[PDB]
Subunit: 389 residues, 4 copies
Amino acid sequence: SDAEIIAYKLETLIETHERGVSIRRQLLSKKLSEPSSLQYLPYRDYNYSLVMGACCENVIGYMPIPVGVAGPLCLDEKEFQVPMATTEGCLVASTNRGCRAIGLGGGASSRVLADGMTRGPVVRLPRACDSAEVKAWLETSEGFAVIKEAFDSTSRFARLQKLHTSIAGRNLYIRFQSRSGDAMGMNMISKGTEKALSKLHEYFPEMQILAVSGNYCTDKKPAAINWIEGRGKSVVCEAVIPAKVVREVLKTTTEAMIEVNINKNLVGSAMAGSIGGYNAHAANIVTAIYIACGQDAAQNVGSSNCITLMEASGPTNEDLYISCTMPSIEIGTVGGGTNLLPQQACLQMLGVQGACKDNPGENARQLARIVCGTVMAGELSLMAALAAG
Amino acid sequence: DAEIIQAYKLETLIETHERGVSIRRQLLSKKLSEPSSLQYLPYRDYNYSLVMGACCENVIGYMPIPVGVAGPLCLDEKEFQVPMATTEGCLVASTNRGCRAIGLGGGASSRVLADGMTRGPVVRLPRACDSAEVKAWLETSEGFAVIKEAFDSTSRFARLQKLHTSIAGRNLYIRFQSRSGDAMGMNMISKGTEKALSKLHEYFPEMQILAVSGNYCTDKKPAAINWIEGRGKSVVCEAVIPAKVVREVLKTTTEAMIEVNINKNLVGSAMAGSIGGYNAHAANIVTAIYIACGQDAAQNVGSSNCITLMEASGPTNEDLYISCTMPSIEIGTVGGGTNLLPQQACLQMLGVQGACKDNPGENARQLARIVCGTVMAGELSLMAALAA
Amino acid sequence: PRPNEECKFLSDAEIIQLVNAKHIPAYKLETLIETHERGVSIRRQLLSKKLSEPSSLQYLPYRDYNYSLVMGACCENVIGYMPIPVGVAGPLCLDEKEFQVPMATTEGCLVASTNRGCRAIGLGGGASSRVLADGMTRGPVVRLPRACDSAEVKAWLETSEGFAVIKEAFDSTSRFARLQKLHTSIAGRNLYIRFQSRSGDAMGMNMISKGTEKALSKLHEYFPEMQILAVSGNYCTDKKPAAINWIEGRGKSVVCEAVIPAKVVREVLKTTTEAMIEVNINKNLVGSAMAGSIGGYNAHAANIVTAIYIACGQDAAQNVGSSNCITLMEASGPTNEDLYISCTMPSIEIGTVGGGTNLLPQQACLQMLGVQGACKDNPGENARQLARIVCGTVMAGELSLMAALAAG
Amino acid sequence: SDAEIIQLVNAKHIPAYKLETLIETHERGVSIRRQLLSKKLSEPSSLQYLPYRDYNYSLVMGACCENVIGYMPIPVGVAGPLCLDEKEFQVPMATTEGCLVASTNRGCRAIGLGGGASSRVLADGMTRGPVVRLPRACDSAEVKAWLETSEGFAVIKEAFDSTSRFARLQKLHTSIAGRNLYIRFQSRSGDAMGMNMISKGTEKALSKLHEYFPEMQILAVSGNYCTDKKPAAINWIEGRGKSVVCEAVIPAKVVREVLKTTTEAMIEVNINKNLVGSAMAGSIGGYNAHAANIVTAIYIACGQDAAQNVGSSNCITLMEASGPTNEDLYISCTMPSIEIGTVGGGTNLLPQQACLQMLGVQGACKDNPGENARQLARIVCGTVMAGELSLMAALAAG
Ligand SMILES: CCC(C)(C)C(=O)O[C@H]1C[C@@H](C)C=C2C=C[C@H](C)[C@H](CC[C@@H](O)C[C@@H](O)CC(=O)O)[C@H]21
Ligand SMILES: CCC(C)(C)C(=O)O[C@H]1C[C@@H](C)C=C2C=C[C@H](C)[C@H](CC[C@@H](O)C[C@@H](O)CC(=O)O)[C@H]21
Ligand SMILES: CCC(C)(C)C(=O)O[C@H]1C[C@@H](C)C=C2C=C[C@H](C)[C@H](CC[C@@H](O)C[C@@H](O)CC(=O)O)[C@H]21
Ligand SMILES: CCC(C)(C)C(=O)O[C@H]1C[C@@H](C)C=C2C=C[C@H](C)[C@H](CC[C@@H](O)C[C@@H](O)CC(=O)O)[C@H]21
Ligand SMILES: Nc1ncnc2c1ncn2[C@@H]1O[C@H](COP(=O)(O)OP(=O)(O)O)[C@@H](O)[C@H]1O
Ligand SMILES: Nc1ncnc2c1ncn2[C@@H]1O[C@H](COP(=O)(O)OP(=O)(O)O)[C@@H](O)[C@H]1O
Ligand SMILES: Nc1ncnc2c1ncn2[C@@H]1O[C@H](COP(=O)(O)OP(=O)(O)O)[C@@H](O)[C@H]1O
Ligand SMILES: Nc1ncnc2c1ncn2[C@@H]1O[C@H](COP(=O)(O)OP(=O)(O)O)[C@@H](O)[C@H]1O
Ligand SMILES: Nc1ncnc2c1ncn2[C@@H]1O[C@H](COP(=O)(O)OP(=O)(O)O)[C@@H](O)[C@H]1O
């Protein structure tokens, strides 16, 4: 009976997933200064089977995030209705206005420049001379192949690319980079890396593997390395907004937009000492789409890297040319939070849910292009509001 | 529903909020390649009244994020049950293990070092000589007083603490820093900044206000200025984990934890060219708590700034001393997403919901201390897993 | 060559043999030998043996140099001097004055290029400059038993009464030592304190270090458990790139500006205002952004800073932070024909008194600019003037290089 | 006579910088320029102490400097011997900062008594990062992809490699910013620092690229993506010039007797100053105590480009407790971007060639091109380590 059972060791004891959640809440309530705190924290009628043992632990319910829609987004001759999970007012409306200006401008074009999730472990040799020897070995075409072999043998999608190594005395940081089908790829690349390091330990028995991640990836921390070499998907997007569209939809001029972009996104960011933060609010857009689509929201740290550029275009130089370059969009359409039904619905809205069996990785690339496009719409709108004052 | 279809202004016309959403979902399905997708996106039985006109537009439903609990967190002689909204496996469990090690260690201590949300507008003058003149005026006690007088006149909770100005030729970037009670403060600081710039314009007519935000705040973009001068709440957290607790709960040694922290969080981050990213995964913890508590998750960019330090402690130097310093936690307990009931529930769990009537700001400071403490628990756990 | 027992005025070969035998270190040759140049000569001969090529030094000068000013002040184990070609760029029309700028360098085209830049500025009606801030810094690192204690010290240092006792201790060390403010940063139980103060006409490193040591003693009386780990915890920050110098400044923060008429851009610079602007934005702003630069938003300010620093006896290693600069260009005038240019340098570490400025040749270069030594009437004015000159010369240099990049 | 030549100039019929070609002797040209400059000064006798007599200006005029009015004497001191890679070096240091040479000398002493230092060159390649523009981001994206294929690379490599004897194009790193494309060219350059050589190779390579993409606009041969003489994370992360690492172990006894401190005190200072302190200051590549002091002193003495001390001084200094009882001091210095050369520029002058000869690296290495420059870079990293050891000890000893 309910009261007779009277934490994580609940789903294993009982049988029904919701029962265990309900018991944990009642248990928790006794340990709080306000037992009625959880009154308004919903938990009923939720599919906990997909969550248990894959996405969360010690579950006591779920947090509802308002989902809005911005669009249509005219990108690469297609139209997208973009789902955005946010609690910030004006965000969805503002982004929507941006999409409008792009559509009335003939749409936006985007390109995926690079694709590759990374993992940067740190190993240490007894002496720097030894670590230097390993670096040189890793750089020989013969040393690389054996490493790519041990790395690729862990998965169908594990296809190791370039190897970026860096030395700090007897320490050696190795940045592994590989595609990962339609998955964001963190778990996959970690597995490949472990196998690859094990193989390297056989050639250099004196090598000590200090940590599978030595912050050289770099994952969820700001880093110049992600900005300069990319991580995940590097994307670029562009569009031209007609002078009339800038005055009527955005309520400003091409000249004012350009002056704000240069002195805010370029000079202002420079004065603030920014690395990769040469935009107005890409993070707002990235975060909203990530939460709605089951992405890892903590990856918004590097995923939001962006340089927004604006310039006079057209016959009379009265048209607004805009481009957004995002070198490190960490994203996926398979695994993690994308395995849940509500987030899968948002992914389906964009036509990128799950794997693309015929062209592996295409769904994730499409999603990355959508994010870059939506960021551009968001940048257009906020810059206009700042310019119009 | 029939010929009602004959846009965002639905609840502006129709009666029920849930009906206005149902209809918006119907209008949208006609533009989708897979109209059946919306079937799994919930929307039923949710208080949209609090959302409409405040937190979101063009609403088509809501996204459920699994909420887990980590704790108890023994911090400043209190115990906290920490709500974490996440879809990443092992996160809540790992953080929970970290809390365990801290409690068995006698708990953690934290201090709020600074408190002040910022806004950094960019203005321009005719010549660099003029912008230099404005900078000099702004740095006098008389000049600051008038600016402060005008800034503080916009709110009861808006109190200008200082000004930091930088010029770039004829451009002048002014960083306004102010307390904001229990609110994260962006809107409040923006209002005060507009009023202050208006007053500055009266002293310098030839001044052009280019943008209320010139990226000098800096908001939601990585910037050395937030790391060096702070933004929102600057917090420091510490704890000592006994040798046996490291061995038994964390499954490693103090020596291995220290070697991993130095070569990963310090040297590794240095090699990667990081500014403010001298930690293992503070962003994971910050994000999870932010989503659960109705914070602005996009502020995870600067809020996650953290330097994790580990040292040998005790009589025999077998104990693990750990500290986490987070100079820029942007947080609040009133307004924005904290106005919604489910997120208010998570805030209530921590005893920091809404405004602290007695001492405005105490709830937000408490929440910031809780975040720094939870990050430290998270850092302990992940470093242990990496060392082992 | 007399025996060692028999051995001021002797034979060179005899001194050498004495050095080898009594194992006397070469650096004692100044306080053992008669004329200054002989001590050097002997050391050159002493070192000449250790070389795989004994005749290496043959072309390294040493004769006819004032070693008295150098010994015990600017260099040790002296074996001669390195001649750096000095060129002149000018006149530089700045703040309604004209300057003939000395530049020590071995890089071809630098002086010529900078000279062309000065020409364009003069024909443009000159340049205007302003000193925005002045204050050398030192950022020591101290430790407390706990983060809670370091937090307590930070709060204490932020009270008006706490700051006053520190300021009193700091200022009691020198006439020009005047503590301006305190920026304090915590990293767990560690506490980094950035001291900032004016220093008359001196660059001020030694002076600020002395003040800092005294102030930390006073602080130690209030917090006996405080451990002073290092008088410099890299929070100054001295001779290393750092966002803190860029954002808060160090030494002298300066801004310079000038408008180059379209006519002058076409004829002297061989390009257009539009091309210059496009190069500046995509190189100095966007390019530097893509490269992950902090404070390097310019074309080659380091070239100019270094050349003037070596010629004027400044500390050339300080070129690391001193070269921080953001170069901005934009359309100006009736028909947006003219080129508006500005250079903002937040951290020029400079001085006209002390260190290498005490030597005669570099004093000559300082005299050329009218800023040699201390300003008796207005302490610090000579150093501020020199900083303004450097910013102005950098702008001239930026104009010229940008033009060469834009044209061809 | 001089009086006559001066009156001719004050007639506007000669600028003043035409003297070397106008006159016969170089030194007299300098003398006349000095007299002319004197009348324009608020204090005419100010040049009194600026030397100029008896200096081989032939090697300078037309190659190293313009409008020459004399020379600036920089005191040269010697630090050593530096026990590095089983060799001994007497290191020349041009400086006006007191205690620098002495301090570095003490550092060398501690290293020698510890069994010497070992160093390795990890990478070698000068760079140039021009910026070009295409009509659209889609076009710049197409060029990036093209440059990434084997065909496009070989074509660019061939054109680059055809400009010089040492032009051997390696990796081609590229970055896009909308319709802008930044291309980082990297190549070895024998024993030369290589700026001019790489610039020449870059110009032709861009010509060849223009034939395949006629709509491409070459905005600047240098778009600050090299990056030359400005602080940049790209040089720290990918290197520029020579990447070097050096290491040594100092016995507990030597740390106590020579450095006047303990290994424990050293380690605590290094971590909290060079790592944590630099982190708090927001440094990129400045994880050392004073590598710039050593780099600058050696650069000036050896005819290097002193302005390159901006990136050349990038360094991470690491210290660790080593040995039987963990009382021995292990130290390492990693410098990813030492821009250096032993041929060309200021190294063409006799006085600086003398300093280079002192180290045995003057000019070209006939047998193995580049070896002299690599040796010099190793010497710089080693001397930096000796300098780091000494300053850290002084900071530790209170
Ligand atoms: C800070 C600028 C501004 C316009 C005053 C502001 O408050 O507008 C709010 C309220 C309303 C007016 C309209 C808006 C339109 C678009 C955006 C979603 C914007 C919020 C932007 C904010 O989330 C991030 C910025 O602070 C980044 C920056 O530009 O520095 C939002
Ligand atoms: C990060 C490498 C590692 C430990 C193999 C890993 O996969 O552990 C996973 C699974 C399990 C083992 C235990 C864990 C404990 C704590 C964390 C929530 C961790 C996920 C880390 C990830 O969210 C970010 C890191 O990649 C950041 C970094 O340390 O560079 C998580
Ligand atoms: C920068 C490339 C370029 C213009 C082709 C070049 O070789 O010009 C040389 C030779 C001659 C043409 C004219 C010049 C004019 C002005 C400067 C002193 C320049 C050399 C600058 C160099 O020392 C640093 C740059 O490389 C910095 C940058 O990236 O802009 C110098
Ligand atoms: C900053 C150190 C200290 C002790 C205050 C100082 O004045 O020592 C001077 C005088 C004497 C004591 C011994 C010394 C030994 C070695 C060096 C050449 C040092 C000058 C260092 C200075 O040129 C750069 C540092 O300031 C960098 C930093 O550590 O932040 C020099
Ligand atoms: N599923 C989980 N949910 C929450 N916390 C967990 C979970 N699994 C482990 N933990 C935490 O991690 C610690 C590890 O203990 P345990 O799970 O028994 O594993 P171990 O074999 O490492 O001892 C526990 O003290 C608990 O706080
Ligand atoms: N204790 C409190 N602290 C802060 N704001 C409070 C408090 N009590 C009430 N408020 C109200 O809440 C407002 C802050 O919310 P909001 O306008 O959304 O701005 P912000 O962007 O700062 O959250 C204040 O202007 C004030 O009217
Ligand atoms: N050899 C040089 N030495 C010094 N300055 C030079 C030299 N060559 C050119 N300059 C500078 O460049 C400017 C331009 O002169 P020049 O190159 O002859 O072109 P033009 O005479 O066509 O304007 C001169 O006013 C001078 O400042
Ligand atoms: N003027 C100097 N020139 C060169 N080296 C010096 C000088 N002063 C000190 N040293 C270095 O310091 C070492 C010894 O330090 P210490 O025992 O304090 O004696 P002292 O300071 O008299 O040399 C010497 O071996 C030498 O490397
Ligand atoms: N061993 C060598 N190493 C380098 N350069 C050499 C060598 N032998 C001859 N050279 C010549 O010297 C040139 C390098 O000097 P220079 O053109 O002044 O450029 P930099 O000073 O920028 O390296 C090479 O392009 C080549 O013509």
